[PDB]
């Protein structure tokens, strides 16, 4: 399945990203902008917090802390640096 | 490619080292089967030509050609093909003579 007498016929001598000599992937600018922090934070939506409150997993009369969110599986990861809340959801109950 | 016992027993009746040595007999048997394909295809042409020669000879004995007899028999809706007409030419010459004189009669009415 290799064809006739090329360099592909010899086997393991040419990298997949070599394109002939025009280094096209080396013609684009390099950006060193580090993104802001909060991309290392866990992102949790108010919609998931409200969904867990309607399911009955979260107390909704007591305070809902990060420990309560971690134990009920509302945060589906290990919280390394913290939890960022983003939202715009409709809530019918008061929540601390 | 082809089983080695099959190649040996196909080359059984060859001559020389092409009978017993396996890798000479392999090429010889492959060429023999390529010959067999063309020979099978040429059987039909050879025997049709042989039949047409026999019809032409038996028709020219009675003064008619092959063309006249075939055209007259097809014009009278007689569906005898070349094989049975050649067999009638060889083995029933009186039947073939009757056919030739009848075809002369109806394609000689004016």
């Amino acid at each position: 399945g290799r064809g006739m007498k090329g360099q592909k016929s010899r086997g393991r001598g040419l990298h997949m990203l070599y394109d002939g000599g025009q280094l096209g992937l080396l013609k684009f600018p390099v950006t060193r902008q580090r993104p802001s922090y909060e991309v290392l934070y866990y992102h949790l939506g108010l919609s998931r917090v409200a969904e867990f409150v309607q399911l009955g997993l979260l107390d909704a009369g007591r305070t809902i802390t990060m420990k309560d969110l971690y134990d009920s599986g509302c945060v589906t990861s290990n919280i390394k640096y913290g939890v960022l809340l983003y939202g715009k959801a409709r809530l019918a109950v008061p929540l601390d | 490619p082809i089983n080695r016992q099959k190649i040996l027993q196909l080359a059984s009746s060859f001559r020389g080292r092409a009978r017993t040595c396996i890798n000479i007999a392999r090429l010889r048997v492959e060429k023999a089967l390529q010959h067999a394909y063309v020979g099978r295809k040429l059987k039909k042409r050879h025997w049709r030509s042989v039949w047409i020669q026999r019809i032409n000879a038996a028709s020219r004995e009675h003064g008619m050609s092959y063309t006249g007899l075939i055209t007259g028999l097809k014009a009278e809706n007689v569906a005898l093909n070349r094989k049975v007409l050649s067999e009638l030419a060889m083995s029933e010459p009186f039947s073939f003579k009757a056919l030739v004189e009848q075809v002369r009669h109806m394609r000689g009415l004016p």
């Binding site: 993104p35 909060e38 991309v39 992102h43 939506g45 919609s47 998931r48 409200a50 969904e51 409150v53 309607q54 399911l55 009955g56 909704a60 983003y86 409709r90 809530l91 019918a92 109950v93 | -």
Partner: protein, 438 residues
């Protein structure tokens, strides 16, 4: 701009999609502006869908099906509905009231009925407590849940009792235009009997909320049409009465909410106020709603031109009523197939989003003969036999109208969509129209 013929990325969609936040599949669903675009999004992430994505997909399928004017029984809509039904069967006890209400409303408004044991599971999961699901969910979730369970059959009358017992203390904190959907959902099932009692109690308290002033002037337009219909249909049976305060408020707010109804909603509201005054069409209200009825008759479906023709049936001698009725006559002539299209061609119908089913509604308007329009050609025939002297100035028009009414009646009787009583009434109306036509 990739390759000069591929659309350049939009500004607000790229600003919404490029977030550090999660929620990418739901944002891709919400920016899908047509049907197999949504289906390709569901295909790309089919090993990645969670209950929130299923609720968003059902709601978006509902909105995109209503956004075009194509039927919900199209094969694309039914394939997306069955694909979502697989995930609904997978997550049938994990769905919260938001997501269960989302999938129920989305699959009922595209008229895809779930298996009834799945509906039973999905409602018993809503009430598998001391009603605590219905007290943490907002009013829109209760409205969508009631609308979804009014479809899918499920006239259980024991589930509805505990739902109405859960929603009755919370009902006066609801926003005042979700109440007609609750009353319509209770009426749509076999609840509200004598054509159990907490259902009638919450319907009565909802209609008491809807009947008052200072809120009836604050409903959105096209919610006042359904509220007026529900009041005129259920006033003397259970709730409020004849009194002129309500009728004055309805007429006053109807005079303000006229331009914001689509033309399929105007004759329902005007027949609603006509039924309200019988528990008619008063002066100087018809003269300002009738230019809207003539300007909305260019894009108006056949049951809506029934309702407008029945509305304009009891008076035809007025010239404004007369040329409004001949405008409805030309509209009914337009969207009903000829007995023998030419407006637009079928090869150029859009597969896109905006009003592609409206283009398919022209370009051989046959094939839109469902059962609703099958009975509705009989209704339009009766309504135009009632309105004699408005169209009878045009002889060839009413003759061709009778020809198309008879042709559609014969075709839909051949399809098995009519019976002998409707056929006899259709025959009486078409012979009246054909006798008037010569």
């Amino acid at each position: 701009l990739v390759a000069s013929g591929i659309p350049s990325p939009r500004a607000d969609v790229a600003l919404q999609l490029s977030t550090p936040h999660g929620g990418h599949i739901n944002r891709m669903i919400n920016t899908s502006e047509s049907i197999v675009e949504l289906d390709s999004i569901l295909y790309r992430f089919r090993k990645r869908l969670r209950p929130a994505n299923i609720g968003a997909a059902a709601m978006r399928l509902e909105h995109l099906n209503r956004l075009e004017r194509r039927t919900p029984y199209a094969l694309r809509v039914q394939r997306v509905a069955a694909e979502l039904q697989k995930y609904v069967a997978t997550y049938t006890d994990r769905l919260a009231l938001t997501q269960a209400a989302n999938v129920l409303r989305g699959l009922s408004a595209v008229r895809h009925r779930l298996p009834p044991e799945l509906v039973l599971r999905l409602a018993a999961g809503a009430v598998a407590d001391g009603g605590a699901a219905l007290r943490l969910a907002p009013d829109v979730d209760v409205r969508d849940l009631c609308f979804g369970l009014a479809g899918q059959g499920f006239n259980n009358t024991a589930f509805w009792a505990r739902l109405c017992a859960a929603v009755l203390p919370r009902l006066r904190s609801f926003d005042p235009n979700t109440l007609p959907a609750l009353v319509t959902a209770l009426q749509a099932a076999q609840q509200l009997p004598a054509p159990s009692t907490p259902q009638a109690a919450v319907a009565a308290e909802a209609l008491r909320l809807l009947s008052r002033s200072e809120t009836l002037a604050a409903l959105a337009p096209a919610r006042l049409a359904d509220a007026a219909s529900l009041l005129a249909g259920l006033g003397p049976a259970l709730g409020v009465a004849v009194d002129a305060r309500l009728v004055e408020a309805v007429q006053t707010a109807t005079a303000r909410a006229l331009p914001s109804l689509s033309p399929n909603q105007l004759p329902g509201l005007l027949l609603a106020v006509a039924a309200l005054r019988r528990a008619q069409l008063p002066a100087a209200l018809l003269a300002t709603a009738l230019p809207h009825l003539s300007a909305g008759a260019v894009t108006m479906d056949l049951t809506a031109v029934m309702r407008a023709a029945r509305l304009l049936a009891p008076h035809a001698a007025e010239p404004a009523a007369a040329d409004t009725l001949v405008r409805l006559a030309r509209r009914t002539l337009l969207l009903l197939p000829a007995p023998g299209e030419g407006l637009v061609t079928l090869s150029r119908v859009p597969r896109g989003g905006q009003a592609a089913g409206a283009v398919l509604a022209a370009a051989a308007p046959a094939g839109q003969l469902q059962g609703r329009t099958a009975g509705a050609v009989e209704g339009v025939a009766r309504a135009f036999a009632a309105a004699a002297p408005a169209v009878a100035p045009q002889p060839a028009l009413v003759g061709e109208l009778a020809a198309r009414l008879a042709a559609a009646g014969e075709a839909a009787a051949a399809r098995g969509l009519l019976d002998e009583a409707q056929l006899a009434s259709l025959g009486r109306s078409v012979e009246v129209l054909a006798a008037a036509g010569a």
